[PDB]
Amino acid sequence: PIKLARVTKVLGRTGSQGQCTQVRVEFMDDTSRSIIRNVKGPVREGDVLTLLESEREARRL
Amino acid sequence: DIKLFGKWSTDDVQINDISLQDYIAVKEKYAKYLPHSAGRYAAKRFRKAQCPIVERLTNSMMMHGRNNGKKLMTVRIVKHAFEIIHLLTGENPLQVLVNAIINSGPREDSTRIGRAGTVRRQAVDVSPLRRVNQAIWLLCTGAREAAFRNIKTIAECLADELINAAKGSSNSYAIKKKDELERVAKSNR
Amino acid sequence: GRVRTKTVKKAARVIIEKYYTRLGNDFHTNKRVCEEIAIIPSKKLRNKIAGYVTHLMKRIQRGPVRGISIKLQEEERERRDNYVPEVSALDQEIIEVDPDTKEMLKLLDFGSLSNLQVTQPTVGMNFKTPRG
RNA sequence: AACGAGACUCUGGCAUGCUAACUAGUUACGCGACCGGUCGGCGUAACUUCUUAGAGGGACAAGUGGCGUUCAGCCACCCGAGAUUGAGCAAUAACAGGUCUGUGAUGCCCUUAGAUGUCCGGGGCUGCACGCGCGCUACACUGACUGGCUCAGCGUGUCCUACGCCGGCAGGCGCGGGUAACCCGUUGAACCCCAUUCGUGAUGGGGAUCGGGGAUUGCAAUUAUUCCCCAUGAACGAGGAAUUCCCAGUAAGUGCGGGUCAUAAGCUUGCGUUGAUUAAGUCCCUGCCCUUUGUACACACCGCCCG
RNA sequence: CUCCCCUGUGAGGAACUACUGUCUUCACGCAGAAAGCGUCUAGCCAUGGCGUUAGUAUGAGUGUCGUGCAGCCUCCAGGACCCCCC
RNA sequence: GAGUAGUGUUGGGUCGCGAAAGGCCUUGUGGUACUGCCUGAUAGGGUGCUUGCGAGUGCCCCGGGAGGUCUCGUAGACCACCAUG
Ligand SMILES: [Mg+2]
Ligand SMILES: [Mg+2]
Structure with a gap:
C-alpha cells in the first residue's frame, strides 16, 4: 500500500558522507503512530513524505 | 490578467498530491509573463522553493x-515546446508540466554504503x-539524449518527452531512470 | 558568524556602567550617546558597541546583569525584592510536629505551647536508597 | 591584560539631501531637416536626477516572533539600498625550502691577454622512434554558414589614430587631433536577438599537414617571425584506470584592456557581458590541528638498541 | 448480523451505420528488458559497471480493415457504509 | 446457634479459615471512598494491557444513555601489508 507521512522533527544527519537526513514521521491518517525514517535531499519540518513501504523503520548508516 | 507567453492561463491548472502542492509553483501568485526574472533564489535555503516552475524547467535546459x-x-525553446504540446494533447500545457514533474520524480532512492x-x-x-529537482533534471536530460542527433528540434523532442512523462509511458528517458531507482530501492529495502 | 569582539562587549559594559542614566532603549539614541560619551575611531566599531549597550539594556530591565553594577538598578532591585504578604507564612493556627520534637521542647519547658499538633510517627523504617 | 583572529586600508552596492563642473551631461528655447514627433545636428540661458567625487550619513542581529542553563548566540519574518562585497596587511617560532642567474648586495674557490673578459660574424636554446605535465580547439540541430538589428568596461597613447583617395584582401598614400572625462571614442567588441541556406554521411562539423602567390616588420625572415588569397583538406563519433577547480553576478560561455612588444598572444594580468544546476551538511576519504594516553627517544623514530 | 450509496463485465436491450474516444489487422519509425553466459573492478568477493544473448522478448503511438469496445437503461456482484466489536 | 460443626499446616500452641439446621425477642447502624487479571481478604506476593518508548487515563457486575480514529510529550538510533638510516 502507498501511504503519506508528516514531519514532526528533524534530529540529525545520517550518512558516511553526510548524505541522509534522519527525520521523525507522524502518519497523516490521523493515527498517532510515530516512526523514525531516512530521507534524501533537503527537509524542513511540516513536509509530507510518500512511503511505498510504510512499515519499514530507520537504521543508522 | 496574467497570461503565460501571452496566450496561456495559469490559474486553471491543478495539483493532485499534497507533497508537491507546497513546492511546485505558478498557481496562485507566482505566475508571470516571462520565465526570466533574473532573481536570486539560491540566496537562502529553500528560497528556490518559491520560484516559478516554468523558470525552473527553463534554468535546467542550459x-x-x-x-x-x-x-x-x-x-x-520552452516557448515553442508549449505551443507544440497544446496541439497534441489539447490541454493546458502547464498541466503537462505538473503531471511530468509528479510522475518523473523518484519516490524511493538508494544511498551508497x-x-x-x-x-x-x-x-x-x-x-x-x-523530488521536484531530480524530476526536472530527468526531464532536461531525457530531452537532450533523445534530441542529440535524431535531427529533432528540442521543442519537438521536449514536448515529446514531457507528454510521455505525463502519460506514464516508458518512452520518456525520465520515467525510465525513475523506474530503475524505485526497482533498486526494491532490491535492497 | 556574527559575534562581538572583546572590545565590543567590554566597552559597552563600562559605557553602560558609568552612563546608565543617559542611555535609552533606542538604537540611534545611544549611538549618538556614544559618539559623545566615549571616543571611538571609525564607524563599524561605534555602531557595534552601541548596539551592545542597547542589547544589554533590554537585558537589564529584565533583571540583574552579570557584568555591570549600577546603584540605580540596585535601588530598583531594592524595590522589586522588598515585598511581604499581608500575613506571614510563619503563622499557622496548627503546626504539626513529631512526638520527639515535642520531647525536645519539653526539655526547654515549651511543652505548654497551644498551636502544636502531635502527628502520628511513621511505622515503617525505610529512609534508605536500595543500593545496586 | 598583550600580540595573532577581528578592528584597519583598498574595491563594489545606497544618497531625486549637500558641495559643484565649458574638459561631463541635463532640461528649456531658438535655428536645421524629413515626413506634432524623429535626429550625436549646431548654438545658448537651466540645473545636477544622469556623468564624475568629495564631505558626511547608513547596519548595529537592528525591529518583531520562535530555539536557547532565555547566556552567548542560532532560525524565520518585516522595516530597508545592504541582514553572506571581494582583496591587502599577517604572532611566538622554525625549514639546514627557492635565490651566486635581479642587485656597484657578498664570505670563499677559480679564471685572469692563444682570458671563464668583452665585442664582431655565423650557428645553437626550436632539433625527434619516446614517456609525463598546464593550455588551446573541436567533435555539430541549444549547431555551421549568409545577411540584417542593437550592447560593454578596464585601461593603454609623441605612439594611439579622425576623414578622404587608390587598393578584391593584407595594405599604401596621404592630409588632421591628442601629454589626454579635451583627440582615437556616444569607445556601434563577442555571443545573444531576427530572417536565410544547410539536412545525420568524415557532411558545409573539424580543420592539422602542405604547394603555390601578394603585403608588412626589420641590418638581417631560409630553420615557414607574422599577416593575407586560393587550393590541400588529415586525426577527432563526448574520451579507459585515475583526478583537478568550484556555493551566487558565483560556475560557464563569450569577447575586450594591461604585461612581454621593432613586428607578436594558443600565455599571464585585469575587464565587462549572457548567466545556471546543487548544497547551507558530514568526517568516509585526504590533510593538518587540539585533548587523553604509552615511551628505555631529547642531535627527539632518519631516535634508540639486542645477539 | 445486515442494507444501499457508489465502483465491476456476469447476463438482457436501445444504440450499434451517423456520434466521439479505446482494443483488432498491415506499412511506419523511436525509445528497449532480462534468466544467463563471459569479462573487468572493489587487497581476496558481485550484491555492481561493461561485453554477448539482440537491437530479440517487448510498449507507447499514426493511418488502413473491424460490423468490434463502448458510452445510454435494468439487475447479478463488488467495494464505501453501517451496524457490531471495542 | 458458636468463631462450635465441618474444613485447613513448617516448629509447636491457649490455633487459622469459617457453616447450617433451627428457633428466640421485637427493627435488626450511618457517613464516605475503590474495583485489570493470578494467588490467599479492598490486606500480603506475582504479573499486565492503553502509542514504539515515558507520562497521564481507564480497565468488578447490570441497565439505560450517547460520543469516538484518548491526551500530552519523545532518538526509539546497535548488524593482518611494511626491514634499515
Ligand atoms: Mg578523517
Ligand atoms: Mg636521553
Whole structure:
C-alpha cells in the first residue's frame, strides 16, 4: 500500500558522507503512530513524505 | 490578467498530491509573463522553493557546455515546446508540466554504503524538493539524449518527452531512470 | 558568524556602567550617546558597541546583569525584592510536629505551647536508597 | 591584560539631501531637416536626477516572533539600498625550502691577454622512434554558414589614430587631433536577438599537414617571425584506470584592456557581458590541528638498541 | 448480523451505420528488458559497471480493415457504509 | 446457634479459615471512598494491557444513555601489508 507521512522533527544527519537526513514521521491518517525514517535531499519540518513501504523503520548508516 | 507567453492561463491548472502542492509553483501568485526574472533564489535555503516552475524547467535546459551561459536559447525553446504540446494533447500545457514533474520524480532512492569501489546501496525515501529537482533534471536530460542527433528540434523532442512523462509511458528517458531507482530501492529495502 | 569582539562587549559594559542614566532603549539614541560619551575611531566599531549597550539594556530591565553594577538598578532591585504578604507564612493556627520534637521542647519547658499538633510517627523504617 | 583572529586600508552596492563642473551631461528655447514627433545636428540661458567625487550619513542581529542553563548566540519574518562585497596587511617560532642567474648586495674557490673578459660574424636554446605535465580547439540541430538589428568596461597613447583617395584582401598614400572625462571614442567588441541556406554521411562539423602567390616588420625572415588569397583538406563519433577547480553576478560561455612588444598572444594580468544546476551538511576519504594516553627517544623514530 | 450509496463485465436491450474516444489487422519509425553466459573492478568477493544473448522478448503511438469496445437503461456482484466489536 | 460443626499446616500452641439446621425477642447502624487479571481478604506476593518508548487515563457486575480514529510529550538510533638510516 502507498501511504503519506508528516514531519514532526528533524534530529540529525545520517550518512558516511553526510548524505541522509534522519527525520521523525507522524502518519497523516490521523493515527498517532510515530516512526523514525531516512530521507534524501533537503527537509524542513511540516513536509509530507510518500512511503511505498510504510512499515519499514530507520537504521543508522 | 496574467497570461503565460501571452496566450496561456495559469490559474486553471491543478495539483493532485499534497507533497508537491507546497513546492511546485505558478498557481496562485507566482505566475508571470516571462520565465526570466533574473532573481536570486539560491540566496537562502529553500528560497528556490518559491520560484516559478516554468523558470525552473527553463534554468535546467542550459545544462550542457556550449549552451551554458545562453539563457535565452531556453525561453525560445520552452516557448515553442508549449505551443507544440497544446496541439497534441489539447490541454493546458502547464498541466503537462505538473503531471511530468509528479510522475518523473523518484519516490524511493538508494544511498551508497560501503567502502569505495564496492557499491552496496540502502533504500531511503525522497524529500519533496528533491523530488521536484531530480524530476526536472530527468526531464532536461531525457530531452537532450533523445534530441542529440535524431535531427529533432528540442521543442519537438521536449514536448515529446514531457507528454510521455505525463502519460506514464516508458518512452520518456525520465520515467525510465525513475523506474530503475524505485526497482533498486526494491532490491535492497 | 556574527559575534562581538572583546572590545565590543567590554566597552559597552563600562559605557553602560558609568552612563546608565543617559542611555535609552533606542538604537540611534545611544549611538549618538556614544559618539559623545566615549571616543571611538571609525564607524563599524561605534555602531557595534552601541548596539551592545542597547542589547544589554533590554537585558537589564529584565533583571540583574552579570557584568555591570549600577546603584540605580540596585535601588530598583531594592524595590522589586522588598515585598511581604499581608500575613506571614510563619503563622499557622496548627503546626504539626513529631512526638520527639515535642520531647525536645519539653526539655526547654515549651511543652505548654497551644498551636502544636502531635502527628502520628511513621511505622515503617525505610529512609534508605536500595543500593545496586 | 598583550600580540595573532577581528578592528584597519583598498574595491563594489545606497544618497531625486549637500558641495559643484565649458574638459561631463541635463532640461528649456531658438535655428536645421524629413515626413506634432524623429535626429550625436549646431548654438545658448537651466540645473545636477544622469556623468564624475568629495564631505558626511547608513547596519548595529537592528525591529518583531520562535530555539536557547532565555547566556552567548542560532532560525524565520518585516522595516530597508545592504541582514553572506571581494582583496591587502599577517604572532611566538622554525625549514639546514627557492635565490651566486635581479642587485656597484657578498664570505670563499677559480679564471685572469692563444682570458671563464668583452665585442664582431655565423650557428645553437626550436632539433625527434619516446614517456609525463598546464593550455588551446573541436567533435555539430541549444549547431555551421549568409545577411540584417542593437550592447560593454578596464585601461593603454609623441605612439594611439579622425576623414578622404587608390587598393578584391593584407595594405599604401596621404592630409588632421591628442601629454589626454579635451583627440582615437556616444569607445556601434563577442555571443545573444531576427530572417536565410544547410539536412545525420568524415557532411558545409573539424580543420592539422602542405604547394603555390601578394603585403608588412626589420641590418638581417631560409630553420615557414607574422599577416593575407586560393587550393590541400588529415586525426577527432563526448574520451579507459585515475583526478583537478568550484556555493551566487558565483560556475560557464563569450569577447575586450594591461604585461612581454621593432613586428607578436594558443600565455599571464585585469575587464565587462549572457548567466545556471546543487548544497547551507558530514568526517568516509585526504590533510593538518587540539585533548587523553604509552615511551628505555631529547642531535627527539632518519631516535634508540639486542645477539 | 445486515442494507444501499457508489465502483465491476456476469447476463438482457436501445444504440450499434451517423456520434466521439479505446482494443483488432498491415506499412511506419523511436525509445528497449532480462534468466544467463563471459569479462573487468572493489587487497581476496558481485550484491555492481561493461561485453554477448539482440537491437530479440517487448510498449507507447499514426493511418488502413473491424460490423468490434463502448458510452445510454435494468439487475447479478463488488467495494464505501453501517451496524457490531471495542 | 458458636468463631462450635465441618474444613485447613513448617516448629509447636491457649490455633487459622469459617457453616447450617433451627428457633428466640421485637427493627435488626450511618457517613464516605475503590474495583485489570493470578494467588490467599479492598490486606500480603506475582504479573499486565492503553502509542514504539515515558507520562497521564481507564480497565468488578447490570441497565439505560450517547460520543469516538484518548491526551500530552519523545532518538526509539546497535548488524593482518611494511626491514634499515
Ligand atoms: Mg578523517
Ligand atoms: Mg636521553
